[PDB]
Design a protein around this ligand. Sequence first.
Ligand SMILES: Nc1ncnc2c1ncn2[C@@H]1O[C@H](COP(=O)(O)OP(=O)(O)O)[C@@H](O)[C@H]1O
Ligand SMILES: Nc1ccn([C@@H]2O[C@H](COP(=O)(O)OP(=O)(O)O)[C@@H](O)[C@H]2O)c(=O)n1
Ligand SMILES: [Cl-]
Length: 270
Amino acid sequence: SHMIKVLSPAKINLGLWVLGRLPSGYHEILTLYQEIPFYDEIYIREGVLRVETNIGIPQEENLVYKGLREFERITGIEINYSIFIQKNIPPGAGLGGGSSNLAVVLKKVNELLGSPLSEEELRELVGSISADAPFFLLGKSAIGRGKGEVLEPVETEISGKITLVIPQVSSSTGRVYSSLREEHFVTPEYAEEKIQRIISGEVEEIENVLGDIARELYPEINEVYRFVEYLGFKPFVSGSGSTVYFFGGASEELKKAAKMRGWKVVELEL
Ligand SMILES: Nc1ncnc2c1ncn2[C@@H]1O[C@H](COP(=O)(O)OP(=O)(O)O)[C@@H](O)[C@H]1O
Ligand SMILES: Nc1ccn([C@@H]2O[C@H](COP(=O)(O)OP(=O)(O)O)[C@@H](O)[C@H]2O)c(=O)n1
Ligand SMILES: [Cl-]
């Protein structure tokens, strides 16, 4: 009852660098987050606390449910909202779809409940569940530090066409970080120079070691990477895979080869 709809956007990493290993066993990163016009559709209704999707994600596993239940635990308030998410952003595509879902729902539910959580409290809540989530409370363009949750909004000189080519294989972030050799690490200073160049519009400066690894672990990601090269474009990888992107439009040759393999092609403009 009283149905409202909210969009839940995807992100790409315009470069990612691993800086070190933290006491938790998690890795410190530098990355440039970019919100893209590619959305999940979320329906928010008054009713029993429920989180359903259209792709069969178990409610207990759902980041949105874990968020709303933690909301209840922290605030003592009973959340009486039914959530249905139409999942267009594929899980494991390195596009932070789950984190986006988490962030947008909790921000809206907070607002609906008269904002019992401050910006600091909302951000720390979503961040405790997912490091990529706080970015989606800002959107647009931001440098991500720590594990990604320490953010600095920036304005980039990047505009024009960006095309995503999404393989079928779902990339595991855990497996990718586990294959990461201590020699793949870089200094924050190196990564900072790279990011500054990318912000200025020098997209050829984008790189991502997790993509190097994803390509070694999941051959289909490598196939997509190689195919984008064959088309005469520099390919880039989002998150820990699986999505390969490039700066140019989708051609009929790409589209046809995608349909034959089941690759999702997403044509964006910034
Ligand atoms: N609402 C959600 N949407 C997508 N994935 C989710 C959600 N809740 C939990 N997950 C988990 O996150 C994994 C995929 O991560 P996702 O955030 O979609 O992209 P990535 O982590 O590759 O950037 C899934 O395998 C799934 O188990
Ligand atoms: N910044 C990060 C993010 C993830 N990881 C690793 O990747 C695993 C899976 O990441 P995830 O965010 O998809 O799942 P969680 O285990 O965080 O719930 C984590 O358990 C970490 O071991 C990391 O080392 N550093
Ligand atoms: Cl890359």
